[PDB]
Design a protein around this ligand. Structure first.
Ligand SMILES: NC(=O)c1ccc[n+]([C@@H]2O[C@H](COP(=O)([O-])OP(=O)(O)OC[C@H]3O[C@@H](n4cnc5c(N)ncnc54)[C@H](O)[C@@H]3O)[C@@H](O)[C@H]2O)c1
Ligand SMILES: NC(=O)c1ccc[n+]([C@@H]2O[C@H](COP(=O)([O-])OP(=O)(O)OC[C@H]3O[C@@H](n4cnc5c(N)ncnc54)[C@H](O)[C@@H]3O)[C@@H](O)[C@H]2O)c1
Ligand SMILES: O=c1ccn([C@@H]2O[C@H](COP(=O)(O)OP(=O)(O)O[C@H]3O[C@H](CO)[C@H](O)[C@H](O)[C@H]3O)[C@@H](O)[C@H]2O)c(=O)[nH]1
Ligand SMILES: O=c1ccn([C@@H]2O[C@H](COP(=O)(O)OP(=O)(O)O[C@H]3O[C@H](CO)[C@H](O)[C@H](O)[C@H]3O)[C@@H](O)[C@H]2O)c(=O)[nH]1
Lengths: 304, 304
């Protein structure tokens, strides 16, 4: 069995790659950047915005993890091509080359400001960022390809995933900020925003379990939340990171939106319900939001 | 107040145009084909697949009705560009040029094989065609633009709309078939498929009412079903059309899918719930599905 991982060189994807090699799969990495970790993995540099990206590339299953992950309105076209056109180009390659299954990296942002927290998968699409819209659009398209062409689609709605090699997000930004100036930490928003953080090891294991189980179901489409069970405030994240570095910076709140978000489209409060994932797979997290945040801070502290 | 109508030269759009001129609006028509009916309407030939389509075009409200309406899998990229990229290009023009409102032509296909018939707007996206996916994707994007940029979005989910100038769909196809050969009528599917048909006059009036009322609400996004209250079987449509023409053709059923659909992705049974539309606006249909079908047959019979 051949597994293609798009975005294989990036954060979650690379972890996915390593784990798939170990378990015995013939792994194909497709990414716009090079990563030459060793291993069995057949390497391809391609741009998924190109319809013809997958020429001469063959797999039975694709993990589609190529995207631009940054939520931060100003340049929606880049989001559009990177997140919408690229996903369509993946699904067209899957259709025409006999790929059986798509595992799609989705996101908690598909829910927007959710009406129920912890958020169940039954909650409707209400995204508030162009990135959330692009993920929801991707989900709809991959589900349709499932129903119409039999390219079954597991949409995995990730909350924040944190660990070694992460190069985006609050922990990474906070660390990079204190590196430039240790005395001041600018924090976007009103400091009160609260989100779950799942350590990468836990995320990978929930993803692979859910995939295995999806394969023994026959629903054309399944959407599954993969996140932690608790949340951490941004101010608490600021302290954890500061402590790891041995620092006590001046915390400067940056006003941005009437309602205290860090930027327009920033969801302030998020925790996903992981009942379905637990039920279906027997998966549990091995860390809390706080522990995952601290461990990642330590990881990125030594890398960066 | 300036109203831009994309797809202004086509079936629903042109009717929308004429009606908007009468009521006093400064109307701007944007379409890839020319239509020179007279009137106040400022005319533009543009391709909405072009990001720069709306250069020098200004409006306070857009009715976005430019699309490829054909559901009939084989060429999804054309659907993608025509229905997804074009809608994104409209929304980007609306954002950057101070447009206040989008009226988006959506479709009953966003529901797929609906679990409840008549289908309420609360029913989730389960499209079974690439066209349905593209409409659902459009809805998600325009809703997000509403929430994020204040470009409020009325998504109008049309069931079949039928009348003068219609050049696609079953009635048009049946007529064109009997014109080529009056003795044989090929009917796709198992003949049992059942759908509502709303006469164009009724559709236009429900659209303009819902728009007026949407403007006095403050929900960023509203999705509204606009359809008839009853359905007609394809075989009954075949007879109505045949009778209008004075004909009794041999009815030949064409097998296509294990489950009797005319093609993969063809929804067999559809009727939308129009409670919300009635409640909000005091709108009623003036015809039945059967009457609208017969009247359209007569209309297209004399045009074609
Ligand atoms: N990390 C999280 O917390 C999280 C949460 C929710 C969803 N996700 C989704 O997980 C997936 C990856 O997340 P990540 O954090 O690893 O980000 P990342 O940036 O580390 O990984 C993405 C990889 O995609 C590649 N890529 C981008 N555009 C490409 C293109 N056009 N063609 C080929 N390759 C391209 C990038 O080079 C990168 O290596 C994305 O879909 C992301 O939106 C991540
Ligand atoms: N007619 C119905 O029963 C019905 C039902 C549900 C939804 N809708 C939606 O209503 C809208 C119009 O339906 P219709 O039946 O009038 O179809 P139509 O083909 O008569 O009208 C569409 C118009 O869009 C124009 N167009 C297409 N691509 C374009 C582009 N790239 N740039 C500029 N113009 C372009 C076409 O030239 C045409 O004049 C579409 O969004 C359709 O999907 C119609
Ligand atoms: O430099 C920063 C960066 C972020 N924040 C704030 O702290 C919170 C950070 O929350 P997240 O950890 O969720 O970071 P993002 O909002 O950037 O992450 C979002 O995008 C991710 C991918 O980048 C995932 O999709 C994830 O599901 C989604 O929450 C936000 O409310 C933000 O306002 C700051 O104050 N300063
Ligand atoms: O030549 C034909 C054409 C259609 N049919 C059958 O009769 C039914 C026709 O139903 P519709 O009137 O709904 O026609 P479409 O399925 O082509 O229309 C669909 O696409 C439309 C735009 O083209 C609208 O979006 C509408 O909501 C959606 O039902 C279908 O089940 C189809 O299988 C035939 O037998 N022969």
């Amino acid at each position: 069995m051949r597994i293609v991982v798009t975005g294989g060189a990036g954060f979650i994807g690379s972890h996915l790659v390593d784990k798939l090699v170990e378990l015995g799969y013939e792994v194909v990495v497709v990414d716009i950047v090079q990563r030459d970790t060793g291993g069995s993995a057949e390497l391809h540099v391609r741009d998924l915005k190109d319809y013809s990206w997958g020429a001469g590339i063959k797999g039975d299953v694709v993990f589609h993890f190529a995207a631009n992950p940054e939520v931060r309105t100003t340049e929606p076209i880049v989001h559009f091509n990177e997140n919408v056109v690229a996903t369509f180009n993946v699904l067209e390659w899957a259709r025409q080359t006999g790929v059986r299954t798509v595992v799609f990296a989705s996101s908690s942002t598909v829910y927007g400001d959710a009406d129920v927290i912890p958020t169940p998968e039954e909650e409707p699409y209400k995204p508030i960022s162009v990135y959330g819209a692009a993920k929801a659009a991707g989900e709809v398209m991959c589900a349709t390809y499932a129903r119409l062409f039999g390219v079954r689609c597991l949409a995995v709605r990730y909350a924040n995933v944190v660990g070694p090699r992460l190069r985006h997000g609050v922990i990474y930004d906070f660390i990079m900020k204190l590196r430039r100036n240790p005395n001041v930490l600018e924090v976007l928003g009103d400091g009160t925003q609260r989100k779950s953080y799942l350590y990468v090891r836990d995320a990978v294991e929930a993803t692979l379990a859910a995939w295995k189980k999806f394969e023994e179901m026959d629903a054309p489409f399944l959407a599954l939340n993969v996140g932690n069970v608790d949340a951490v405030r941004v101010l608490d994240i600021a302290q954890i990171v500061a402590e790891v570095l041995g620092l006590r910076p001046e915390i400067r709140l940056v006003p941005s939106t009437p309602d205290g978000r860090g930027w327009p489209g920033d969801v302030k409060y998020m925790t996903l319900a992981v009942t379905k994932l637990m039920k279906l797979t027997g998966w549990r997290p091995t860390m809390t939001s706080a522990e995952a945040v601290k461990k990642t801070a330590e990881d990125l502290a030594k890398e960066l």
